[PDB]
Amino acid sequence: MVGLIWAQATSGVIGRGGDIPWRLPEDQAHFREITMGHTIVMGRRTWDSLPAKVRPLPGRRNVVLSRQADFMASGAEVVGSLEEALTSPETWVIGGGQVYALALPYATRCEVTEVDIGLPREAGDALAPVLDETWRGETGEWRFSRSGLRYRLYSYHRS
């Protein structure tokens, strides 16, 4: 089972300028709940965006995709191909834009957080993948953050 997990603005934006363009603690707990104890796979750019205190993400086997055979990352398994990255029975792909696109055909689950923020797409943004009709989805009820942000969770499956 390969799953994708991401948080997006309604527009589809998941990243801009190498960061996630909002703060949503409740989403972080959700992310932790889904991924804990499992292998997580991420692109090198997403690995870089992790704060040092949380790099590698603890309690998870961190796998980082890079075409750089040189690339070093303490606490992470650096691999040069997707095949090398998806060798765990339950694998969660945690970003970013490039790697969601690469892993999407391998995926049978998506766990999506939608953030109700005004954030129209700009050229060069990292974007969420588009889920087509092969997917079946359940839409969660809207929640309000601490904070000021409305958000909701989707669970998507295909067999």
Ligand SMILES: NC(=O)C1=CN([C@@H]2O[C@H](COP(=O)(O)OP(=O)(O)OC[C@H]3O[C@@H](n4cnc5c(N)ncnc54)[C@H](OP(=O)(O)O)[C@@H]3O)[C@@H](O)[C@H]2O)C=CC1
């Ligand atoms: N909102 C969310 O849920 C999330 C948001 N983000 C955001 O996403 C953005 C980063 O995503 P993105 O810019 O798309 O970059 P990625 O995080 O997807 O990493 C891209 C890198 O992955 C490596 N790579 C890509 N394809 C391959 C391949 N086929 N084989 C081997 N290595 C490969 C390369 O690393 P190299 O260049 O070293 O070869 C490439 O530069 C940031 O803004 C981040 O904050 C990230 C995760 C989740």
Ligand SMILES: CCc1nc(N)nc(N)c1C#C[C@H](C)c1cc(OC)cc(-c2ccc(C(=O)O)cc2)c1
């Ligand atoms: C929490 C954000 C997030 N939400 C969802 N639903 N899917 C995702 N794939 C990511 C993501 C991501 C990137 C890798 C990221 C960036 C970041 O910048 C501060 C922090 C985290 C992060 C995730 C979990 C934990 C934790 O378990 O304590 C800490 C930091 C994770």
